[PDB]
Every structure is written in C-alpha cells, then in structure tokens.
C-alpha cells in the first residue's frame, strides 16, 4: 500500500527473446510502476531495491568458447544515458551429450529519480530457460 | 531520508587488494554510516539488510586445486569478537588457455547494535576482477 512495487517473470510463449509479463499469478505491478517496452519505469524518486535472476540451459557444449552475461541498466531521464548498475559474467563450458544448467542472480540498492527506466538484459537468448515458473524474474521495491 | 544506507564498490585504481569506495557515481553512503578502514559502521541499532557480490576471473587453471571464498563478518562493540554472518565457497577448476569467470553473491537480514563493524572479505585478491562497473560491491540498508 502506497509503496511502488514490481515483480515480473519471463514470457514462456516466446522464443529467442525475453519479454516480461505482469498478467500472471504470483507477479506484481502496483502503485505507479509501469512496464513500457520491456522496461519498468520509476514513478517517484527515492531509494529502491533492485533484483533479477536468470537461468541458462545448454545441451552438450559448443566447439567454441561461450561467455554468458546478465546485466541491469539504468536510463536517466535527464542527460539521456545508459549506465550499468549490476552485472555478471559466467562461462559454462571448460572443454570440448548431457545438459548443463547455470543460474545468475543480481541485487542491490540504488537511489533513482522520477521517470528513470530500468532494464535487465542478456546476450544469448537462445540459451535461456523459461519453461518452468520462478526460473527467470526481475523486480524492484521502493523503501 | 533518515534511513542509514550504504552501497560501495571496489577500487579499480588498486592491484592485488580490495578497497571500497564511496566517491563514485551510483554509489551511496548516507545517514550516519561510515567507512573507516575498509569497514562499514552501523550508526544505530536495528534490523539491517546486508548484501555483497564479487567476481573472480582466471586465465587457464593452476596445476594445484584452488578454492575461493567470499565472507561477510561482524565485529561487536562489546565483548570484541568476529563472528561469521554469511559465507560461501566455490571451485572453478577440475583438470589442468581460455579464461573463466565465477560470481558469488550473499545476502541476508540481521539485527545489529550501534557501533558494530561489518566487513566483506575474500582470500585470493590476485584473482579478483574489478575492471568494469557493478561487478564487485557491498552494501547495507536499514529498516
């Protein structure tokens, strides 16, 4: 109540992409936070807690080395830019039919102004795992 | 905001060490929390949320097995001690030129008194990766 909040999950009815959803049970979008073009928009200035987790799955391992990344980025309303708040990199393969799974989690506390737009991004969507529930999500909460 | 808060990042202008900074954009130090000798000092008793994440990078793998750790520890003002609040261990190598990356994240909620000092530490600073932004950080928030 009177506390902006959002918690969105991936879109399972999509392939090779990452679309957030808020029309599912056990998902949240309340008190002014808006999802506009895969981005949650801060409704009022203040401190916020930002978190996001993704999971990658892969059968076998590529001949070439592969590096996966997960990032969360800001967009200042003034002096339009895109800074990197939280980021992480992981490498699943080490050499060379069993599958492998890799989770990545990020979270932090940041001070944001009104109208800033946050976005969580990856680099190899074809490796993403959005089959089950609660395996990919991204959210913010005001304090 | 009358809410003690801190979010500090590593120091890129350092080698083989881990020094926190609060004089960067998108970093926080407000409402009584103090950074004194690589430590965050609680300004008032209450419940706090404590989090921290680090990233290790390594070319190849050593002949000997290497274990990396990330811990968060508390120094009580009375009966001076150093207890372990959150900790984790990881091992990236299993046999025997491509690089590897490993992230570690910790977070929890604890009740702290006034003047207790928190510290986040690792064991192999030469393996740390602080080149980019948002890859290493440590922070607390009061609530």
């Amino acid at each position: 109540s009177d506390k902006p909040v959002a918690h969105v999950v991936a879109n399972p009815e999509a392939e090779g992409q990452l679309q957030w959803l808020s029309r599912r049970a056990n998902a949240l979008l309340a008190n002014g936070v808006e999802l506009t073009d895969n981005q949650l928009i801060v409704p009022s200035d203040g401190l916020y807690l930002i978190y996001s987790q993704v999971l990658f799955k892969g059968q076998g391992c590529p001949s070439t080395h592969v590096l996966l990344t997960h990032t969360i980025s800001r967009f200042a309303v003034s002096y339009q830019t895109k800074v990197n708040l939280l980021s992480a990199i992981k490498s699943p393969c080490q050499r060379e039919a069993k599958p492998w799974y890799e989770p990545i989690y990020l979270g932090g506390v940041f001070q944001l102004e009104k109208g800033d737009r946050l976005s969580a991004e990856i680099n190899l969507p074809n490796y993403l795992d959005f089959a089950e529930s609660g395996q990919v999500y991204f959210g913010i909460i005001a304090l | 905001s009358d809410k003690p808060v801190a979010h500090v990042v590593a120091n890129p202008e350092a080698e083989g060490q881990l020094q926190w900074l609060s004089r960067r954009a998108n970093a926080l130090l407000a409402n009584g929390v103090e950074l004194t000798d690589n430590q965050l000092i609680v300004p008032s008793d209450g419940l706090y949320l404590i989090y921290s994440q680090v990233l290790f990078k390594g070319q190849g793998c050593p002949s000997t097995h290497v274990l990396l750790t990330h811990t968060i520890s508390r120094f009580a003002v009375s009966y001076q001690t150093k207890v372990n609040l959150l900790s984790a261990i990881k091992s990236p190598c299993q046999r025997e030129a491509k690089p590897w990356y490993e992230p570690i994240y910790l977070g929890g909620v604890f009740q702290l008194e006034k003047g207790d000092r928190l510290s986040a530490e690792i064991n192999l600073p030469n393996y740390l990766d602080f080149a980019e932004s948002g890859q290493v950080y440590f922070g607390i928030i009061a609530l």
Partner: nanobody
Amino acid sequence: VQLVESGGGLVQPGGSLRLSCAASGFTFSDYWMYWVRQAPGKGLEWVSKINTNGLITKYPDSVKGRFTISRDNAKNTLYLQMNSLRPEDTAVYYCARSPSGFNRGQGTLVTVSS
C-alpha cells in the same frame, strides 16, 4: 567530454572501411555506446549499440550482417568495422552516448561512390 571521430574516406562498392572514436571526461567503462549515422536529406538513425562489457551488440535490419562494433576500455576507444558497402551507406557518422544522438563532438563522412 568530447568524442573525436576519424577513418573516413571513399570506398568503391564491395570494399571495407573502418571508423573509430575516442572519449574523455567520463568513465568510459560505464555507459553504453552508440554509432549513429546522419544521411544527407534523411533523418538521424542509430546504426550500432554496445554495452559496458562488450558482449551485447545490436544492429538494425538495414545494416545487420555487414557491420562489426567493438570497444577497448583501457584506451577509452570505440570501433566500427565496415564490410561489403553499398551506396546506401553514404552519410556522416558520429559516436554518441544515446541512439538518437547526444554528445557527438564531430562526425566523419563516408561516401560509397559506384
């Protein structure tokens, strides 16, 4: 906070050019970087987007397949590699912090004369 561009010239069709940008006055290892192009008699459109650690790359469909973007954070520089050019890629090119154009000190002309 200036960003100098270079690498321009004339390329006969089927060739390969390579532009470049430098930066100063800000932490180059933070912001996403954008290669934008302004064409004579047309609007201003972005041609490339790259993120902080260089593992996220984005192109429009009119350009995708023939360009390559990159950066070096130690030297505070951003690149652009040109392959199999066409007369459509005859315009001025800027390096900026926003896909719509922002903080583009100079621009370099690339003409593909057939």
